[PDB]
Amino acid sequence: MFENITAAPADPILGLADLFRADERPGKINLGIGLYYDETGKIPVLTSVKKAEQYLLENETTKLYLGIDGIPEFGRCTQELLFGKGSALINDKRARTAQTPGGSGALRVAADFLAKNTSVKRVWVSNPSWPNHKSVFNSAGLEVREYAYYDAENHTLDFDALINSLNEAQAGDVVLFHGCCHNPTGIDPTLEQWQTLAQLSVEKGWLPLFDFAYQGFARGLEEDAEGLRAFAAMHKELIVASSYSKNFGLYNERVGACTLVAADSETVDRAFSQMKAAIRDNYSSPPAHGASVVATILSNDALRAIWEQELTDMRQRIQRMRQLFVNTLQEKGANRDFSFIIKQNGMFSFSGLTKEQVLRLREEFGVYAVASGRVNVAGMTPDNMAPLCEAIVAVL
Amino acid sequence: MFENITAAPADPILGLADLFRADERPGKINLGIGLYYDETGKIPVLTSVKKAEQYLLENETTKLYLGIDGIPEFGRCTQELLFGKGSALINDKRARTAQTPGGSGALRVAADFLAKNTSVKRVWVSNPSWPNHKSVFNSAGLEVREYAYYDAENHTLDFDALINSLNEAQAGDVVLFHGCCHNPTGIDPTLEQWQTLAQLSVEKGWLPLFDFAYQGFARGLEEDAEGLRAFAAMHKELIVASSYSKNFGLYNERVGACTLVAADSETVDRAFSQMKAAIRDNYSSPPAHGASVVATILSNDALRAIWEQELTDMRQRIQRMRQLFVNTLQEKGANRDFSFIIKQNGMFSFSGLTKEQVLRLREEFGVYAVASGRVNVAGMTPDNMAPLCEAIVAVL
Ligand SMILES: O=C(O)CCc1ccccc1
Numbered sequence: 001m002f003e004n005i006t007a008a009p010a011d012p013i014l015g016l017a018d019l020f021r022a023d024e025r026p027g028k029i030n031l032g033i034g035l036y037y038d039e040t041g042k043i044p045v046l047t048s049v050k051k052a053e054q055y056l057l058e059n060e061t062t063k064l065y066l067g068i069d070g071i072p073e074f075g076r077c078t079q080e081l082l083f084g085k086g087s088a089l090i091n092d093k094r095a096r097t098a099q100t101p102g103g104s105g106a107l108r109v110a111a112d113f114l115a116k117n118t119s120v121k122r123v124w125v126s127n128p129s130w131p132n133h134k135s136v137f138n139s140a141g142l143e144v145r146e147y148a149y150y151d152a153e154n155h156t157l158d159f160d161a162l163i164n165s166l167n168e169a170q171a172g173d174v175v176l177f178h179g180c181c182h183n184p185t186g187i188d189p190t191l192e193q194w195q196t197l198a199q200l201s202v203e204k205g206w207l208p209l210f211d212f213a214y215q216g217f218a219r220g221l222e223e224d225a226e227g228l229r230a231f232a233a234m235h236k237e238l239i240v241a242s243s244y245s246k247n248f249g250l251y252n253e254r255v256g257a258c259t260l261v262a263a264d265s266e267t268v269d270r271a272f273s274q275m276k277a278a279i280r281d282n283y284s285s286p287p288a289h290g291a292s293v294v295a296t297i298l299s300n301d302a303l304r305a306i307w308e309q310e311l312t313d314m315r316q317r318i319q320r321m322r323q324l325f326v327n328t329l330q331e332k333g334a335n336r337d338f339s340f341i342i343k344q345n346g347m348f349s350f351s352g353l354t355k356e357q358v359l360r361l362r363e364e365f366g367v368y369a370v371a372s373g374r375v376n377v378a379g380m381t382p383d384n385m386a387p388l389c390e391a392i393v394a395v396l
Numbered sequence: 397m398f399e400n401i402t403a404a405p406a407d408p409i410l411g412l413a414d415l416f417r418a419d420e421r422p423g424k425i426n427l428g429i430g431l432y433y434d435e436t437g438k439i440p441v442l443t444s445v446k447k448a449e450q451y452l453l454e455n456e457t458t459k460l461y462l463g464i465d466g467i468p469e470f471g472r473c474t475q476e477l478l479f480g481k482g483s484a485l486i487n488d489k490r491a492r493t494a495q496t497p498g499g500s501g502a503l504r505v506a507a508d509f510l511a512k513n514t515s516v517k518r519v520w521v522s523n524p525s526w527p528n529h530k531s532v533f534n535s536a537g538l539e540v541r542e543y544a545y546y547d548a549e550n551h552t553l554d555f556d557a558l559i560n561s562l563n564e565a566q567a568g569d570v571v572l573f574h575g576c577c578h579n580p581t582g583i584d585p586t587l588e589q590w591q592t593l594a595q596l597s598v599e600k601g602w603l604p605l606f607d608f609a610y611q612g613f614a615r616g617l618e619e620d621a622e623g624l625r626a627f628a629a630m631h632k633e634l635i636v637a638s639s640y641s642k643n644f645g646l647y648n649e650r651v652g653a654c655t656l657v658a659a660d661s662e663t664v665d666r667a668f669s670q671m672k673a674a675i676r677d678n679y680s681s682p683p684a685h686g687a688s689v690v691a692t693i694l695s696n697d698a699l700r701a702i703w704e705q706e707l708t709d710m711r712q713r714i715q716r717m718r719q720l721f722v723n724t725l726q727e728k729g730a731n732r733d734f735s736f737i738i739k740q741n742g743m744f745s746f747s748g749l750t751k752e753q754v755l756r757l758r759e760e761f762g763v764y765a766v767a768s769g770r771v772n773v774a775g776m777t778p779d780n781m782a783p784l785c786e787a788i789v790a791v792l
């Protein structure tokens with residue numbers, strides 16, 4: 001049965017982990033997959049997380065299956081983060097949240113739900129895009145088309161091209177937006193631009209799907225959700241696939257959420273029953289530990305305070321590395337001005353390095369980035385900055 | 397987009413949790429979903445598990461993403477449990493294991509892998525069947541057909557009917573077997589019958605898919621794997637979807653495995669790359685906590701000893717409840733002899749109660765079973781036995 005199966009192509013992002021592990025050279029620098037490193041060059045467990053895990057160890061008395069949609073408190077805390085405490089969406093019971101195994105799990109659940117229960121055939125994603133969107137949506141039998149987004153000459157959101165390319169999107173198409181810290185460009189709509197897009201979306205009949213994996217990494221928790229909230233104010237229906245991987249440092253525990261919004265409570269409940277069916281046919285019910293940690297932290301004033309400060313500290317360290325990166329490139333004699341990198345939001349810098357420069361960086365220098373030119377600034381430290389910048393200067 | 401969506405039908409098993417929660421009557425008895433309860437009528441966390449969780453709390457320094465196939469030690473320990481230490485399958489590197497979110501996740505991954513990468517169109521399941529098999533395989537676009545299995549008059553495996561119904565299975569069809577503790581009948585093939593089936597399977601060209609969620613609950617860890625090992629000795633290719641939900645009491649942490657076996661290392665590696673692709677397009681990578689607990693326990697002599705005794709204790713308590721159930725029914729004046737229940741393996745008794753008797757049990761008596769007549773013996777205790785048996789006698 002398996003004799004003729006062809007090997008799967010390496011994933012542009014995920015395939016980096018294997019390569020890095022097989023590289024026996026010391027002093028290699030991992031700027032590939034988007035994880036937060038601290039100044040010591042390690043990926044720590046957050047203190048608030050360890051505290052929550054200790055509480056769970058001391059207090060859990062069962063591992064009895066969660067509901068298909070997960071921990072109820074987790075859903076409530078999620079909707080507050082997404083929509084704001086006292087949001088009309090919450091007051092009107094227009095939203096239902098399934099806890100999922102990561103934002104990745106939420107994207108698959110959304111895609112399966114849409115494919116099986118609606119007339120959706122096409123999802124629009126930005127160019128450039130995060131590769132897993134195409135993979136996941138295609139897997140569910142959905143076409144993926146690209147809309148213009150980034151002006152690489154100005155290093156800006158090409159709003160004109162964006163709007164013009166989305167004219168090709170039909171009513172009933174899905175349009176995917178990143179809530180903040182667009183991956184990979186780090187370029188987000190302004191509030192006005194979000195508001196313009198929200199209006200356009202309503203007029204054109206698009207179903208908005210927000211991928212919201214970086215809440216807190218652009219400006220802050222509430223500010224980062226402005227765009228999503230602009231959309232929520234204008235739309236009867238939307239979906240959010242959100243993640244706690246990055247903002248809680250909980251990557252491997254697979255903690256995210258698929259949130260479904262409809263016009264009213266009756267509609268969302270009916271629709272959400274089919275979203276639960278799509279989960280039942282997949283992994284049945286979500287993993288408790290990571291989501292319990294999130295709910296524990298978000299529902300305790302003291303833990304929440306510690307956690308929110310940890311998140312601020314992460315954002316601020318990345319901002320320091322961003323500036324030091326730009327400064328060190330210039331002092332190492334870079335043949336390009338890289339000041340545009342300061343404008344970018346989140347963990348990455350979309351550097352303009354070619355695919356061949358990225359390959360040479362890895363082969364010659366043991367510096368690992370994504371072939372798109374995306375580099376993980378959250379993987380930079382005072383100690384590795386000089387070597388990594390010397391390497392970049394050498395390949396320019 | 398969501399206006400016309402029809403509500404999803406209630407799941408025969410999973411829908412019980414909601415109903416039970418909405419039932420405000422005290423002294424209701426939950427014999428529905430298959431969880432292990434102790435004598436106090438609660439679903440405890442295993443001591444070995446708590447010990448492992450304390451070790452993880454003290455020693456984990458990162459939540460960095462696992463590989464797509466999960467923790468390497470988890471896979472190794474899994475293959476040892478499935479195939480035996482020093483198995484030729486392990487020596488010859490013919491098996492690859494992906495850690496998954498439950499056996500349920502493993503079933504979906506297997507189905508997606510098969511649908512996308514082979515000519516499989518049909519999966520054969522026993523009658524009666526575990527409902528999630530049809531749901532999951534249908535979701536992946538695979539037809540599901542039933543083979544005869546249980547003789548309800550004799551309360552036995554109708555081996556003749558089994559073999560005769562499977563004549564309709566074509567070469568290249570999948571045939572699903574339960575490794576032990578057939579759900580719901582509790583009736584398993586003898587070793588000779590497994591060996592006969594293994595030979596027949598090879599002759600007929602079926603791809604065997606084992607659902608192995610109850611290793612240790614029939615007779616013991618090694619004995620329960622005899623059937624699977626009989627098949628492994630005879631086949632070039634098979635798949636195992638196994639679970640640690642029940643044997644570790646880790647239900648809500650979603651700990652299972654999809655194990656792929658091919659003729660040789662080259663073939664399995666090539667095929668497994670597409671199994672990883674099917675994961676990438678789903679939840680990306682599996683949840684660490686539950687699987688780390690399993691690996692920690694299985695790889696430490698002292699924890700393993702404690703854990704294996706806990707598993708024995710669970711099996712033995714269920715066996716005591718099985719006998720007490722039969723004894724109490726007879727002394728409560730049951731109008732049927734229920735001695736056939738002693739022969740059944742695992743957590744359940746497939747009682748012969750009609751769908752209407754089950755409904756009346758719930759409505760009138762607050763006793764919750766599955767409409768198929770399946771009752772969770774592992775949910776019985778000395779304290780709830782009298783009331784539950786009085787209820788059953790009343791509806792006969
Ligand atoms: O590196 C990234 O783009 C974020 C981390 C990640 C990558 C692929 C799947 C899930 C998360």
Ligand SMILES: O=C(O)CCc1ccccc1
Pocket residue numbers: 284409410428429430431500526528579
């Ligand atoms: O009750 C059962 O049959 C076992 C528990 C279960 C039920 C449905 C999906 C996964 C596990």
